[PDB]
């Protein structure tokens, strides 16, 4: 009599295949608002 072949693969080795890594290199760039000039002056030095 012939010998039947052995097909079979457990659930772990069917769907817990090593998966591709998620692509990540995403820093968050922040822009510093430029400082305003100090246009303010005192009373004594303004009038006297």
């Amino acid at each position: 009599p012939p010998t039947l072949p052995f097909h079979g693969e457990s659930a772990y080795r069917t769907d817990y295949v090593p998966k591709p890594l998620p692509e990540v290199a995403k820093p968050v760039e922040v822009k510093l608002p430029p400082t305003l000039p100090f246009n303010a002056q005192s009373c004594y030095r303004s009038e006297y």
Binding site: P5, H7, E9, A11, R13, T14, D15, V17, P20
Partner: protein, 201 residues
């Protein structure tokens, strides 16, 4: 080495990429053997794909599309049941849009050229002929067997024909559509095919 290592296609990948790394090292602190992400191949050579009425179409025309390999037989009753549904999915998804998004590439389990052509006349998407070894090394790559007749390297049957495998650029299986698989839900697995993430870069 995705989804498997011991494929003829991945053997060819490793040999070509790593001998390129070797000649680069001889020409020049480079890694031996090279990393799998750094391995790059050409999945389809210039004479592989052919659209309807037999004009050559190259790989680089598949850019920006979700491409799925249709592994199919002609006399199989699942295949006969599944072919019109993948036709309507193809037609409606490529009509509902200003850009073509899905592509299908057939490789065959027909016995001979007459069965290949009789099946091929009913499929408008891209196809790969039966004589070139690509239509065999793709099945050895993606674990699809008719029966246990290939020399198998401790594989299991990932699927029986029919199958559709959404593929990537480097041969990595992007996703499986489970017609005859662990979910066994046939002729409705086409709805699980997404086209946002699985692009052919």
């Amino acid at each position: 080495s995705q989804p498997v290592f011991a494929s003829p296609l991945n053997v060819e990948k490793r040999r070509l990429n790593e001998e390129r790394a070797l000649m680069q090292a001889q020409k020049a602190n480079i890694q031996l053997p090279p990393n799998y992400g750094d391995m790059d191949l050409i999945l389809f050579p210039e004479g592989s794909l052919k659209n309807s009425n037999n004009t050559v179409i190259p790989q680089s025309h598949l850019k920006g599309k979700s491409v799925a390999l249709y592994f199919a037989d002609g006399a199989d009753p699942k295949c006969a049941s599944l072919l019109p549904f993948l036709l309507n999915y193809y037609r409606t998804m490529n009509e509902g849009g200003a850009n073509q998004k899905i592509e299908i590439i057939f490789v065959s389990l027909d016995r001979d050229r007459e069965a290949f052509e009789s099946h091929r006349a009913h499929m408008p998407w891209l196809s790969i002929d039966l004589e070139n070894p690509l239509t065999e090394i793709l099945k050895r790559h993606f674990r699809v067997m008719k029966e246990y007749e290939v020399p198998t390297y401790g594989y299991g049957s990932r699927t029986g024909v029919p199958s559709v495998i959404v593929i990537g650029s480097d041969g990595r299986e992007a996703q499986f559509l489970p017609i005859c698989s662990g979910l066994e839900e046939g002729d409705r697995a086409l709805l699980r095919w997404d086209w946002r993430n699985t692009k052919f870069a």
